[PDB]
Amino acid sequence: SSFSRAPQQWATFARIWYLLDGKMQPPGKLAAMASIRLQGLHKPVYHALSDCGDHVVIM
């Protein structure tokens, strides 16, 4: 990518603000995909000590 080390690290480990809708959705399915996104299990750089969670906004 030819980034510098600190911007490259910031870009890799930055947080994302995902949006999710209710409106006749099942809360268990909402909760499953929200739980994956909150843990950060959707990232290939995931590790439990890396604090790689993302924000999820459910309306």
Partner: protein, 148 residues
């Protein structure tokens, strides 16, 4: 134990083997005694095997000190300022040859726990993954539910 001992990463001394290989052993000091039954094996090693080793390794300076001592020792000095003091007390000539050769093939870095048994300085070629990898762009870069 890993938690009770230091650790480091896999490394070379000065990018060794990239342009050329430089033997990291620099000096071998053999304290041996003339009359020691503990030093008999090192006496045989000085008699027979040290000449061929010194010829095979011209970059290593080998000092042999015959002095009254109870425990014969070898001190290996490595190019990065490393010092390894090892007892060759009551070892046969082939055990001493194995040990001295092993010292020759070592590098000066610590024999401690090595995390991550590989070391690259350019881990990615296509670009390291960031979240916006594998994410499509949007017309005018609009955020979700932007009123424009």
């Amino acid at each position: 134990t890993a938690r009770g001992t230091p650790s480091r990463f896999l490394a070379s001394v000065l990018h060794n083997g990239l342009g050329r290989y430089v033997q990291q052993l620099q000096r071998l000091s053999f304290s041996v005694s003339r009359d020691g039954a503990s030093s008999r094996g090192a006496r045989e090693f000085v008699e027979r095997e040290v000449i061929d080793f010194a010829r095979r390794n011209p970059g290593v300076v080998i000092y042999v000190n015959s002095r009254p001592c109870c425990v014969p020792r070898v001190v290996a000095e490595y190019l990065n300022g490393a010092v390894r003091e090892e007892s060759i007390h009551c070892k046969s000539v082939e055990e001493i040859s194995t040990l001295v050769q092993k010292l020759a093939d070592q590098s000066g870095l610590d024999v401690i726990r090595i995390r991550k048994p590989f070391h690259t300085d350019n881990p990615s070629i296509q670009g390291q993954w960031h979240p916006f990898t594998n994410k499509p762009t949007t017309f005018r870069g609009l955020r979700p539910r932007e009123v424009q």
